[PDB]
Amino acid sequence: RTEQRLNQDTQEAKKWEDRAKLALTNGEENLAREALARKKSLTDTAAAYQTQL
């Protein structure tokens, strides 16, 4: 179970990280930061999960 969620959080973190690149290109500091923050939240959960695993 832990493995499933963890491997999923890591993939999702990418979706967010790549979107941050796009947001800056669009000319928006605000949603770029939000995209970065959402990337952080999944990164933090994944970190916790790997240790738990």
Partner 1 sequence: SSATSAFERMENKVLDMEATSQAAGELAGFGIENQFAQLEASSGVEDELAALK
**Chain contacts with partner 1 (rule: CB under 8 A):** 17, 19-29, 31-41
Smallest separation, CB 23 to partner 1 (Å): 7
Smallest separation, CB 26 to partner 1 (Å): 6
| Tokens read off for 22 | 């796009």
CB 16 within 8 A of CB 28: no
Any residues with CB less than 8 A from the CB of 5 and at least 6 apart, and which?
45, 49
Smallest separation, CB 2 to partner 1 (Å): 23
Comparison of 5 and 17: residue with beta carbon closer to partner 1: 17
